[PDB]
């Protein structure tokens, strides 16, 4: 059977330390674990052997009673550890009062399922699963190291700190890896992280499995460069050997967990491939007295550690002759000058092992003090040491560790801890070692960003797509990982609403700069000034001066017989209307306002009706004679026909400015002028024009005072064509106001030019 390392005592506590390597894949069934381990094996085994013969020699802990030990090998396998635990409990079918729990979390679970039946407390130093924190299933399990929830949080913090978004995930099969990845996914995908794929692999899988895994990992190589390994000690080594085999030598940045840590045995011979990796290590200062005791050890003297001779032969490649464990495999013979001092590395968690073997001692001491305070030794009430009492005392245990910090188990049998984010760099030529960079204690991580990536060209960001926010572009996600987007550009009309929708602005509106929001488009009107309104207003002003001159001539020659042929008042109402129609242009081309446009409508309406109606009455009188003072009256009544019409139109169309939007980009303001509200007065004016066309066609060339009718007929004919010429523009355009102004102005200055100008032209003679 297997060998065991006894040491005598009054109270015996067990331990399970992974002295030998994991059994190979092909010999799992035989359960014959392979090579020996130094750090995880002989160092730990020696620690107990010492940290009990310190406790025994110390009078202040457990006086007059001697803790012994039975240290037994678990080969880091759940099957072997279970058989060893069975060997532990064979006595209960001297009793074992407790064990120092095996390193692996899955192995810890397997051994706990058996130990809790016989009420045997178990203390772990490296088991770091969340699954072991549930006291319903694991009542008799306590740890001196924090859970790996905090470790997953630390890894997530590291990932989020360096913009890393698109990462790959690898985890060892078991409880450690499974729980690690579960926590990592749950608490990462929430915040910002985005896992490309997750792969699982056994520690003892063949090289073929690792090759396949590396191919699958390289499948996403261009984008996902960070691999987040909640993996174990040997899984990462397998990955490194696969990397060496496949020729890939630094396209990945492995992001380890507390299986890689500070360990040198996982990067021996493959330092070129793992350079740049970030690991997370439970903090524990190196003990000193253990080194002093350990370095002086020799294979000749240490008989109490049955694995010592084999390890001694394995480390320095030679053989021992004068001892049974010759192991003739090694050729040369060891000389009496070899020592462990050279290339001596004391692993992490050597603080934790001693802290455990203490916590157990302090629990025993407290329960001894409580049960029989008077006696000093094994009292009658202690001979069958009760598991329940021991666990009750152990739950509330509280002391100072070797590191100087204090140890307390909370309600979950757990102890708090701080992480230390190591980094694998290359100091000199062919010289690699782990460099402490950061830390993480209770959600706060201090990181030396300078030490990692001693430059500004850090590792390529593990992102699926570049930041898509340069302007109008707006990301669309194609069903796959929510962190792969395309850069589809929205249109100029819309602005980015969120980041996945862009929404159109109002009918009169435009997106602001940088597409941040939307704001009202500036309004445009016919400003006072401008090219064309000057050409309008100068025409209007010169027309006003001309008509003032004409009325001055009229009033001067008030009683002249050559002009006292027609009704003088009739030849007045014309010019008054002309003047009003002239000021109509001025009140038309102006800043749109409530007070202005109704007056503008009145101007465009009445003047070219009343003046032309006076002309109609004059032509009526002439044609009928070829009456009395009633004609001035009929004029007034004829005018009014229109005043009533326009006042009626004023009701359904009150003067109020509305904004016009011919296109999405420009906005104009005009009042309630409408096609129906303009055509009707223009229609009436047109009807009057057609009525007076008949009388024009009647008069032809009648010999009158200075041949007035001959000029007025031609004038009215010209006005007809000028009026009908401008309709296509006015129907469809944005120049309605200026066109109306021009049309009115040009319709005027023509009738006066032929009805009054020749009279004034010859009035000088």
Ligand X SMILES: N[C@@H](Cn1oc(=O)[nH]c1=O)C(=O)O
How many residues bind a copy of itself (CB under 8 A)? The answer is 35
Bridge partners, 496 (sequence order): 502
Give the CB-nearest residue to ligand NAG.
163
Q: Check residue 191 for interaction with ligand NAG (CB under 6 A).
A: no
> Which residues make Cβ contacts (< 8 Å) with residue 691, sequence separation at least 6?
616
Residue among 18, 22, 43, 104 that touches ligand X (CB under 6 A): 104
Q: Check residue 83 for interaction with a copy of itself (CB under 8 A).
A: yes
Comparing CA positions, the residue from 116, 112, 135, 9 lying closest to residue 67 is 9
415 is known to lie in a ligand binding site: no
How far is 214 from 273, CA to CA, in rounded Å? 13
Q: Check residue 420 for interaction with ligand X (CB under 6 A).
A: no
Q: Check residue 22 for interaction with ligand X (CB under 6 A).
A: no
Q: Check residue 370 for interaction with ligand NAG (CB under 6 A).
A: no
> Which residues make Cβ contacts (< 8 Å) with residue 722, sequence separation at least 6?
743, 746, 747, 750
Q: Check residue 208 for interaction with a copy of itself (CB under 8 A).
A: no
In angstroms, how far is the first alpha carbon of the chain from the final one? Answer: 153
Q: Check residue 128 for interaction with ligand X (CB under 6 A).
A: yes
Site stretch for a copy of itself (CB under 8 A), options 50-58, 134-142, 233-241, 272-280 = 134-142
Q: Is 681 helix (H, G, I), strand (E, B) or coil?
A: helix
Give the CB-nearest residue to ligand X.
233
Q: Check residue 299 for interaction with ligand X (CB under 6 A).
A: no
Q: Check residue 531 for interaction with a copy of itself (CB under 8 A).
A: no
249 is known to lie in a ligand binding site: no
How far is 627 from 617, CA to CA, in rounded Å? 10
Paired tokens of 181: 């990845």
105 is known to lie in a ligand binding site: yes
Q: Which does 232 bind (CB under 5 to 8 A by kind): a copy of itself, ligand NAG, ligand X, none?
A: ligand X
Residue among 57, 60, 136, 333 that touches a copy of itself (CB under 8 A): 136
Q: Which does 126 bind (CB under 5 to 8 A by kind): a copy of itself, ligand X, ligand NAG, none?
A: ligand X
572 is known to lie in a ligand binding site: no
Least distance from a copy of itself to the Cβ atom of residue 186, Å: 12
Q: Which does 163 bind (CB under 5 to 8 A by kind): ligand NAG, ligand X, a copy of itself, none?
A: ligand NAG
Q: Is 384 helix (H, G, I), strand (E, B) or coil?
A: coil
What residues numbered 506-525 form the site for ligand X, per CB under 6 A?
A: none
Residue 426 in contact with residue 420, Cβ under 8 Å?
no
Q: Check residue 121 for interaction with ligand X (CB under 6 A).
A: no
Site stretch for ligand NAG (CB under 6 A), options 156-164, 239-247, 369-377, 383-391 = 156-164
> Which residues make Cβ contacts (< 8 Å) with residue 190, sequence separation at least 6?
none
DSSP states along 538-565:
HHHHHHHHHHHHHHHHHHHTSS-TTTTT
Site stretch for ligand X (CB under 6 A), options 125-133, 401-409, 481-489, 601-609 = 125-133
Least distance from ligand NAG to the Cβ atom of residue 423, Å: 15
Q: Is the dihedral of CA 320, 326, 328, 330 positive or negative?
A: negative
Q: Check residue 163 for interaction with ligand NAG (CB under 6 A).
A: yes
Paired tokens of 313: 């032969």
Instruction: Please report, for residues 111, 150, 734, the alpha-carbon distance to residue 102 in angstroms, rounded to integers and kept in the order given.
Output: 8, 21, 89
Paired tokens of 7: 């040491």
Backbone angles phi, psi at 628, to 5 degrees: 55, -140
Closer CB to ligand NAG, 113 or 482, in the complex: 482
Closer CB to a copy of itself, 562 or 725, in the complex: 725
How far is 71 from 16, CA to CA, in rounded Å? 6
Residue 280 in contact with residue 155, Cβ under 8 Å?
yes
Q: Check residue 101 for interaction with ligand X (CB under 6 A).
A: no
Q: Check residue 103 for interaction with ligand X (CB under 6 A).
A: yes
Q: Is 496 helix (H, G, I), strand (E, B) or coil?
A: strand
Q: Check residue 668 for interaction with ligand X (CB under 6 A).
A: no
Task: Provide the CA 722 distance to its chain's centre, in angstroms.
Answer: 67
Q: Check residue 668 for interaction with ligand NAG (CB under 6 A).
A: no
Residue among 258, 262, 273, 347 that touches ligand X (CB under 6 A): 258
DSSP states along 166-215:
EEEEEEESSHHHHHHHHHHHHHHTTTT-EEEEEEEE-TT--HHHHHHHHH
What residues numbered 197-236 form the site for ligand X, per CB under 6 A?
A: 232-233
Comparing CA positions, the residue from 441, 351, 470, 453 lying closest to residue 51 is 351
Q: Which does 103 bind (CB under 5 to 8 A by kind): ligand X, a copy of itself, ligand NAG, none?
A: ligand X
Least distance from ligand X to the Cβ atom of residue 129, Å: 6
Measured from the Cβ of residue 188, the count of other Cβ atoms closer than 10 Å reads: 23
Which DSSP helix (H) or strand (E) runs through 353? helix 350-371
Residue among 43, 74, 104, 116 that touches a copy of itself (CB under 8 A): 116
CA atoms within 13 A on the CB side of 378: 11
Q: Which does 647 bind (CB under 5 to 8 A by kind): ligand X, a copy of itself, ligand NAG, none?
A: none
| Known binding-site positions for L-glutamate | 40, 105, 126-128, 176, 258, 349
Q: Which residues bind ligand X (CB under 6 A)?
A: 103-105, 126-129, 176, 232-233, 258-259
Q: Which residues bind ligand NAG (CB under 6 A)?
A: 161-163
Q: Which residues bind a copy of itself (CB under 8 A)?
A: 25, 28-29, 78-79, 82-83, 86, 90, 93, 110, 113-114, 116-117, 136-137, 139, 476-480, 482, 488, 500-501, 718, 721, 725-726, 728-729, 732-733
């Amino acid at each position: 059977r297997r060998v065991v390392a006894h040491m005598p005592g009054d109270i015996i506590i067990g331990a399970l330390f992974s002295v030998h390597h994991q059994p190979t894949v092909d010999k799992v069934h035989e359960r014959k674990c392979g090579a020996v381990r130094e750090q995880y094996g002989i160092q730990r085994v020696e620690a107990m052997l010492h940290t009990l013969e310190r406790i025994n020699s110390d009078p202040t802990l457990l006086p007059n009673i001697t803790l012994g030990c039975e240290i037994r090998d678990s080969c880091w396998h759940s099957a072997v550890a279970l058989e060893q635990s069975i060997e532990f409990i064979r006595d209960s079918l001297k009793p074992i009062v407790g064990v120092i729990g095996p390193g692996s979390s899955s192995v810890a679970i397997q051994v706990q399922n058996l130990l809790q039946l016989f009420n045997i407390p178990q203390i772990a130093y490296s088991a770091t699963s969340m699954d072991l924190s549930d006291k319903t299933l694991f009542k008799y399990f306590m740890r001196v190291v924090p859970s790996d929830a905090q470790q997953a949080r630390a890894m997530v913090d590291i990932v989020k700190r360096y913009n890393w978004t698109y990462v790959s995930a690898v985890h060892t099969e078991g409880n450690y890896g499974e729980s690690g990845m579960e926590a990592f996914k749950d608490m990462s995908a929430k915040e910002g992280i985005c896992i490309a794929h997750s792969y699982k692999i056994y520690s003892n899988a063949g090289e073929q499995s690792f090759d396949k895994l590396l191919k699958k990992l390289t499948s996403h190589l261009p984008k996902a460069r960070v691999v987040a390994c909640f993996c174990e000690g040997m899984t990462v080594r397998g990955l490194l050997m696969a990397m060496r085999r496949l020729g890939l030598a630094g396209e990945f940045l492995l992001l380890g967990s507390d299986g890689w840590a500070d360990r040198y045995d996982v990067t021996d011979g493959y330092q070129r491939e793992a350079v740049g990796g970030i690991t997370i290590k439970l903090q524990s200062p190196d003990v000193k007295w253990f080194d002093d005791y350990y370095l002086k050890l020799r294979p000749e003297t240490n008989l109490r550690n049955p694995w010592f001779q084999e390890f001694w032969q394995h480390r320095f490649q030679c053989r021992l002759e004068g001892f049974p464990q010759e192991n003739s495999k090694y050729n040369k013979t060891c000389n009496s000058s070899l020592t462990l001092k050279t290339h001596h590395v004391q692993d992490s968690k050597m603080g934790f092992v001693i802290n455990a073997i203490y916590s157990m001692a302090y629990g025993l001491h407290n329960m001894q003090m409580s049960l029989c305070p008077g006696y000093a030794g094994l009292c009658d009430a202690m001979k069958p040491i009760d598991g329940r009492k021991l666990l009750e005392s152990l739950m509330k245990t509280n002391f100072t560790g070797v590191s100087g910090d204090t140890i307390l188990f909370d309600e979950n049998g757990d102890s708090p801890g701080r992480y230390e984010i190591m980094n694998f760099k290359e100091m000199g030529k062919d010289y690699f070692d782990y460099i402490n960079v950061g830390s993480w204690d209770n959600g706060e991580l201090k990181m030396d960003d300078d030490e990692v990536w001693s430059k500004k060209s850090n590792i390529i960001r593990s992102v699926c797509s570049e930041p898509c926010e340069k302007g109008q572009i707006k990301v669309i996600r194609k069903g796959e990982v929510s962190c792969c987007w395309t850069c589809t550009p929205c249109k100029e009309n819309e602005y980015v609403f969120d980041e996945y929708t862009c929404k159109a602005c109002q009918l009169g509106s435009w997106p602001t700069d940088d597409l941040t929001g939307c704001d009202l488009i500036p309004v445009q009107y016919l400003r006072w000034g401008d090219p064309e309104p000057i050409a309008a207003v100068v025409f209007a002003c010169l027309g006003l001066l001309a008509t003032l001159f004409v009325t001055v001539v009229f009033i001067i020659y008030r009683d002249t017989p050559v002009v006292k042929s027609s009704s003088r008042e009739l030849c007045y109402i014309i010019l008054a209307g002309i003047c009003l129609g002239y000021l109509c242009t001025f009140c038309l081309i102006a800043k749109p306002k409530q007070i202005y446009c109704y007056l503008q409508r009145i101007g465009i309406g009445l003047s070219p009706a009343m003046s032309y109606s006076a002309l109609v009455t004059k032509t009526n009188r002439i044609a009928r004679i070829l009456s009395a003072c009633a004609q001035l009256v009929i004029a007034f009544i004829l005018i009014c026909i229109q005043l009533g019409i326009i006042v009626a139109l004023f009701i359904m169309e009150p003067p109020d400015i509305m904004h016009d939007y011919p296109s999405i980009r420009e906005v104009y303001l005009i009042c309630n002028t409408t096609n129906l509200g303009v055509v009707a007065p223009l229609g009436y004016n047109g009807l009057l024009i057609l009525a007076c066309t008949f009388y024009a066609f009647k008069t032809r060339n009648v010999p009158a005072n200075f041949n007035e009718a001959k000029y007025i007929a031609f004038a009215m004919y010209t006005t007809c064509i000028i009026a009908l010429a401008f309709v296509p523009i006015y129907f469809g355009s944005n120049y309605k106001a200026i066109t109306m102004c021009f049309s009115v102005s040009l319709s005027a200055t023509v009738l006066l030019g032929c009805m009054f100008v020749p009279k004034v032209y010859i009035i000088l003679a």
